[PDB]
C-alpha cells in the first residue's frame, strides 16, 4: 500500500494505489484507498482497511452532524481533530490506521496526517504505507510549491508508479485526486503497467 | 528521547530549544515541527515524545489554565503553580488505566507581580519534568539523547549573568553539539525565549 | 491425604487419615478431615485445606438455616447438591475433593463423591485423596458389599492403614465416624495400634541383599554388617 | 482450550448482468474427522434477493446468520414492511462485523444480490468487516486455487484476442463447476458436493453438483 | 470425571445410541457403573463425551426448561429439534462467556414419526446426519457406521443397526484405552425412548499371530 | 497416508493409498508408497517421504549386497533388524513409519517399525494418518487363514476407510501380494474415485501471449 | 519464512514429445524488488532443463554444485546425464544435507532425444521426489500455478499449445502473488530443437 | 503397562500385560513385554518401547557372547548388572523401567528391579509400569511369600488382571512365564478368561442412581430408563 | 543498514558512495570513516556493516586477490571472478560455526583486456551482494535505510549514457535524499568512481 498527498499553489494532490495483499497472496487489485469523506474532504486508506473505513465513515457522519447543527461546513482542522481524538481514545486497543485528511476550508488548503496512536501532524507533504519509502524519493526530488495542476498530478502519478514498481505490497491502478476551493475532482485513474509503458517507452 | 530539548535560565530570560523531528520508524516524516507550546503569555513548555500524548497533554494543560483564568477573572497563574499542576497531572497519569504520558517536559516562564500586593517570585523560572511526574527547579535542563552532551557543556560554559546574545551563542553551541554527537538527525531546533515582555520565537539559532 | 466412605445397611462409615503436609514436611499430624455438616451428615475433605474448610463452613451454615426454615431434617442429597454447586462455580480457583456421606430417615445412608471437576456421583463407596489411588484394587479384591457396622468400620480402618502405608502424603492417626439412625459414633486409632503397616509385616522383615561382602564366589550370602565380616 | 475452530470449506460468487451465481461446498469437518458431507449452513438467505455465504467457523456463522436475520426483520418492521436492499445489507454486515472487533467472528463472508437496477453485485469481507465490492470472489480453503482461474477467464488479461461476449447464466455455472471440480482434486479440506444458488429477479433456483468424496 | 465415546445411528423406524457405562479420572477407570445416557423430555435422549460435571449441569438446565415450559403453560412439549436447538444455543452462549461446557454431545429423539439425530461440540458446532459419533468413536466407529449405511441406502432395520452398533462397540473396546466392555443402548422410537440394561459384547483374543512365540522379541 | 498389512493363509497382502500432500495441498495423486526391499520382501512407508525413500533404498541395497555375499534369499527378520537399528540410531528424527511384509522359509512375516525404532510383529497392522479408521475395519472383518481374495478385499476395504475418512489419503488403492515364490503388485486394484465432470478444454490459439524476444536452437 | 524471502516461481509442463519450463523474473528481499530480470532456469544439456526456487544464495550455491557434478559426470562418463539419473543425483545431494537442508526446491524437465518420453520431477528441500505425467510447479505462487495447470492442461498438447497454456498459467499465478512477476522466461524443449522465449508480464 | 515378577522356592514367575498405547489409542493389543535374554533369564520392559527393545537386544547380544567365552551359564546378577550399567549411562536419554528375573543354578531364582533412575535392587517381588501403582496395596494384603509354582502363577495372573482393570494404559492379554531348573513354560490367557475384571464383578452390576425421574418426593427410587416411566 | 551505500553504473564508469557513519548505540563515534575498500587497480567494494566483520571480510578478500596475482605472475582477475569469489566466501560463512558476515556489498569494477587474446567483458561492472551470499548484476544498487529512497530516485533519473558530471549531480541528489528522509544522520558519503584509468576518490560529492 502506497499513498501520498502534497500541498501546492493550486490546492492539494492525493494519489493512491489499489492493492491489498494479505501477506503474500494478492487479495484484490481494485481497492479504493481514497475515502471520499464528503464532497469537500478526502481521506486515505492505509493499515487496517476495516479500521480506516469504519472510523472515516464515523468522521463523515460527525462532519455532516456538524454541518446540520451549525449551518456551516466543518474545517479541516476540526475534522482532523475529531479523527485524532477518536484514535487517541483507542491508542491502547490495537488499532492500525494511517490516514491523511486533505481539504479546502475558508482558510485555504490544509493537509493533516493522523496515525493509529492519536498523532496529528500538519505539513505540506506526506507519504504513507509500505511503499512510501519509494514515493518520497521520487516525490521530494520533484516537489515545488509553484507547480501547475497538471505538473503536480504528473508528479504524484509518477511517484505512486515508482512506489508500485519496487514495492511488492503496492500496485494495481494509480488514482489521482485534486482538492481545490470548489471541492475535489478525481483527476485520473490509470493502470500501472500502462504507466510503465508510457514513462519508459520502448 | 530521540528528539533533544534544551533549556537554560539566565538573569533576565530563559531560552529553550526543541528539535522538530518527527519519524515513522527510520523515516523522517518532517524536521520542522514545533514542540514548544506556549501555555500563558509568559509561560511555555518544551515537550519531547510522540505526537499524540504530547499534543494531548499540552492542550489539556493549556485549556485548564485558560479555564482557570476565566473563572478567576483574568488572574494569571504563577510558574510554580502551573508546574505543580502539570506535575500532578503527570503523576496521576502513571497510576491510571490509560497509562502514563510518555512526555518529558522543560517548563519555562517569567513571573511578574500580578498586583501591587504581590510579593512573590520576580525572576525567570525553569523546571525539569520527567514523564513519571518528577519536578525539579534547575538552572538548566535537557531531555533526549543529546541531553547529557549538552549538560556537561552547560556545566562548562553556563553562567548566571549571560546576556541575550551570549545566551544565543551558547544555545547555538549546544545545538551544534547535539547535531555532532547524536546519530539521530536533529537538523532543526526551534528556539524560543521567555523574558519580561513574554515569549519570543528566535530564528537566528536553529 | 486418604479419605473414604462406605455404606452399610444401616448407615455410613467415614474414614480418613490425619496428615496435613507441606509437600515433604508434616505441618500437622493430628488433622481432622471428617467435617460435620449436620448432626448426621459429614464430609471428607481432600486437597487445599483452606478451600475445603471454607466450603464446609459455608455449606454447614447454609444447611443449619435450612433446617430452621423447613422445621425438619436435611437429606444427604441436599448437602451433596450444595457442595456440587459451590464446587462447580469455583472449580477453577479451588483445589478440593469432597465426599458427602450421611444418614437421613428417607433414603437411609448415602455416599456422594464430588471430585475436583465438580460433578456429583451417588455411590456405595467413595475414595479420595492422594492415597486413594492405592485402594481401588484393594476394594476390587477385598471389599464385599453388605457388611455389618463393626465389619464396615474395621474394613475402613484396614483400608486407610493400607493406603497410608504406601502413600508418603498420608499417615498418622486413623479417624472413623459412623452415621446411622442411632447416635453417631467416632473413633481415633493411633499409628502404633494401626491394623497394618509395613514395619510390622513379616514379609518385609528380611532386608534386600544389596551390600555384598567381597567374596571369591558368585554365591549371594547376605549383606555385610560387620567390618571383620 | 480455544474458542475458535476452522471447519474448512469454500464459497464462490460470480455476479452476472441480471443474475448472481453463489456456490458453497457442503462439507463440515472437525479436528481430523468429518462431521458431515451434507452441511447446508454455509449459504443463508436474508431476503428473496440477497444471500450471504460464510467460511470458517460454523458456530460463528450460525450466530452471524441469526443476527443478520433479526436485524433485517427489525428493519422490515421499522420501514413499513420494506425489505432492505443488497447494499444496505452489505453496509449492515460490515458495521456488525466491526462492532465485534475485539472478539471477532471467525467468519469470512460474502453478501451477494441484485442492485436497484437489477445488476448483480458481490461483496467480500475480512474477519473484522472490511467490505469491498466486486463482480466475483472466492473465499475459504480453495480460494487461491480458483480465484486466479476466474481472473484469467473473466478479465482475459495477457490475451492478444478480442474479448468474448459477456457470459450468460449457463456458461457462468459451467465455469464455476469447473473451478470447484479442479479445487476438489487438489485441496484436501473441500469437496463432497457444491450447492449453487442462481439469483435472478424471477425468483432464485437451487442446484446440486457432485464432487469427489476423498 | 470424564466419559468415553458415544455412537449413534438412525435405523428404519427410529434411532439407536450406544455408550459405555464408565467414567474415568485421567487414566484411572474410576466408576464402571454410571448411566451416561440421560432422557430429556418424553421424546429425546442425550449422551456426552468429555467432562461429566459440565454434562450434568447442562442436562439439568435443559431438563428443567422442558418440564417448566410444559407445566407453566398449556402448551405442547418441546420437539426434539427444539430441545437440541436450545441445547446448542446454551452451549454456544457458554462458549462466548469463556466458560465452555467441555463436552461433545450426541442427541437423539423421535416424535410422531420424525426421527432426529444430531451432535454438538463444546464450542458451538452442530450437525445432523444418519450416524453420529464423539470421542474416539468418531475415528473408529464412524467409518464402519458410514460403510454400513452406504451398503444399503434404503434404510437399516433395527436388527441390522444393532448388529453394526455392537460391532463398533467391540472395535472400540479393542482399540480405546479408557473403555470397558459394558455398554448401554438407548432406542428412540415412536412410543418413546427406552434405555436397555447394561450388556457386553463377545471378544476374540485367540489369533494364531497373538501367541507368545510369534510376538516375542528374542 | 494409509498403509495396511495382513497375513493370510500363505503370504502377506500389503496395501496403500496414492495421495501425496504438499502441506495440505495435493502434490501428486498417484504417489507410490509400496517400496521394493527384496524379491520376497516389500515395505510400505508413511510419514516424511524423503526419509522413507532413503531408508528403504539403503536397506534394500544392503540386502542385495548381503544376498550376493551369502547366496541365500533375504530373511524378513534381517530387513526388520536393519530398519529398526537405523531408525533407532536417529532417535526418531528420521520420521518414517514402515509396514514390512515378506515370506521366508519360516513363513509369512508382517511387522511395523515405528519412526523411533520399535517393532511389532502382528497378523494385521495399520500405519499412517488414516491408520485408525483402517484398523477399525481390520478388527471388524479379519479372520485367520483367509484366502488370497479375502485378504485382498479386506486390505482394499481398510484402505478405502482411510481414503474417505482421512483428508491426507485417497485417489487409488495399491495392493501387493507376496507369496513364497511370487510377489505381485497391483496398482489399480480399486479406483473408487473416478474422473467425473470432464474438463471444458478451453482453447488458447498460438500467439495469444505476447513474446518479447525469441531464440530457437536446432539440435 | 526463508523459502519466500527471495520470491520466484518455476513450473514445468509436459507435452507429447516436448516439455515447457517457465520461470518468473523477479528477485527481491521479502518485499523489495532487487531486480526484475533474474530468471531461475538452468540448462544442463540438450535434454534437461531445471529451475531452482527458494533462498537466492542457496539457489546459486546449489546450482554451482550441480554444475560441478554434471561436468564431473560428463568427464568421467563419456555421455550426457539422463533426466532420471540427474533427478536421482539431485535427490541424493539434497538428502545428504538432511538436517542442514538447502533452501531450494528444484523443478526438472527432461526428454529422451531418441525415444521422446518426457520426465518431470519436483523434489522438496530434502529431496522427496514427485514424478507426475502432467505438470510440476514450485515457488511462492505454487498454489495458483497448481490451480491454473489443473484447469488448463490436457494430455495431447502441441509445443505451441503447451507454451500458451504455460504462459497463461504463469502470468495468472504471478498476478495473485506479490513475490513473483515481472514477465516470464520459457523454454520449449522438443526432440529436435530447443526454443527460448520471453513473455510479457505486468510491471507490478 | 503392567509388569511384575515374583520369586517362589524353585524359580521365578514373570507376568505382564499386552498393550502398547499411544496415549489414548491402542496401537498394539497383543504386545509381548517378556523379553528373552538367555534361556533361563528374562526381562519385563516398561516405558519407551524402542528404548527397552534396544536395551534388551544389546544385553542379550552381550550375554550370548559371554556364555561362549566362559563356556558356562550366566547368573541373573550378571544380566542385572548389564542392564543397570546400560540404563545408568543413558538415564537422561531413555525412558525405561526394567525387571530382570531368572534362574541360575548357583543362586536359584532371582528378581531385580531397575527403575528409571538406573539403580538395581534385588527383591523377592518387583512391580513396574503405570499399572504397578495399583498393585502395591494388593501385595501388602493378599501376597504371602513361599507359594508353590502354580500358586505363584495364579497369583501373578490375578494381580495383573486387578492392575489393568483400573489402569487405562494397561489391558488385553495376560502373559506369564515360569523360569526354574526345569524347562521354562509360558502361558497367555485372554481378557474374556481373565481371573478378574469389573465387568463380571457382581458388586459393580447395579448402576449408580444418577438419572432421577421427575418425582413429587425426595425418595430415591432408581434411574429413569423409559420415556413413559 | 544504518549506513547507506549507493552505486550506479554508466557507459564509461561506475560511481559508488558510502556513508562514513560509525556509532555506539546512539553516539556518533565518527562521521568520516571510509567504507569503500579498493581490492584491485580497477576493482572496489562499498561495504555496509559494523567495523569488525566488514574490515575482516574486505582484508581477507583483498589479501586473497593479491596472493592469486602473485601466484599467477601478475595476472589480474576479472570482475565476475572476484564477485563470485566474494559470493562463495559469504555463502560459506552462513553455514559455518563462526556465523555469517553481517556485511552488505556493492562491488564495482572496470574490465580491461588483459592480453591481445582476451575476448571478455570490456565495459564497467556492478554487483549487488547480500550478506547471505546473494549476487546479482544490476545497473544500480543500494544498501541501508535510504536505499529504497535512492532506488526509486534512480528509477526516475538514471540513464545508461550519463556523463561524469551528470552522474556526479545524480549522486549528489541521491545523497541529499538520504540526508533528507533518513532519521539516521548520514552527513558524509565518501564517493568514489571506477573508470578505465582505475579508481578515483571524488571529493565534490559528499
Ligand atoms: C507520515 C508517514 C510516513 C511514512 C510511513 N510509513 C509507513 C510504513 O509502513 N513504512 C514501511 C515500514 C518501514 C519502511 C516501509 C507507515 C506510515 N503510516 C502508517 C500506515 C499504516 C498504519 C499506521 C501508520 C507512514 C506515515
Residue numbers in the entry:
A (entry chain l): 100 to 301
B (entry chain k), I (entry chain K): 1 to 206
C (entry chain h), H (entry chain H): 55 to 283
D (entry chain m): 126 to 339
E (entry chain n): 2 to 219
F (entry chain I): 30 to 248
G (entry chain J): 2 to 205
Paper text:
Tropical disease drug discovery is challenging and very few parasite drug targets have been validated, yet some breakthroughs have emerged for the treatment of sleeping sickness. Each ring consists of seven different subunits with β1, β2, and β5 being the catalytically active subunits that cleave cellular proteins selected for degradation. The proteasome was previously demonstrated to be a validated target for combatting parasitic diseases including HAT, Chagas disease, and Leishmaniasis. The compounds discussed here are T. b. brucei-specific chymotrypsin-like proteasome inhibitors, which are binding at the interface of the β4 and the β5 subunit with more than 1000× selectivity against the human proteasome.
Our starting point was compound 1, which was discovered as a singleton hit from a biochemical HTS screen with 3 million compounds against Leishmania tarentolae 20S proteasome. After rapidly screening different tertiary and secondary amines, we noted a steep increase in activity with the latter (e.g., compound 2). We could rationalize the improvement through the use of computational modeling and the subsequent cryo-EM structure of compound 2 bound with L. tarentolae 20S proteasome. The newly introduced N–H (R4) is masked in an intramolecular H-bond, retaining the desired permeability properties, while at the same time restricting the conformation of the tail-piece (R3) to fit into the channel pocket of the binding site. The main interactions responsible for the potency were hypothesized to be the aniline N–H interaction with Tyr113 and noncovalent molecular interactions including π-stacking of the quinoline aromatic system with Phe24. The application of the cryo-EM structure allowed us to identify the minimum pharmacophore. Guided by a cryo-EM structure of an active compound bound to the proteasome, we were able to rapidly optimize the potency of candidate compounds.
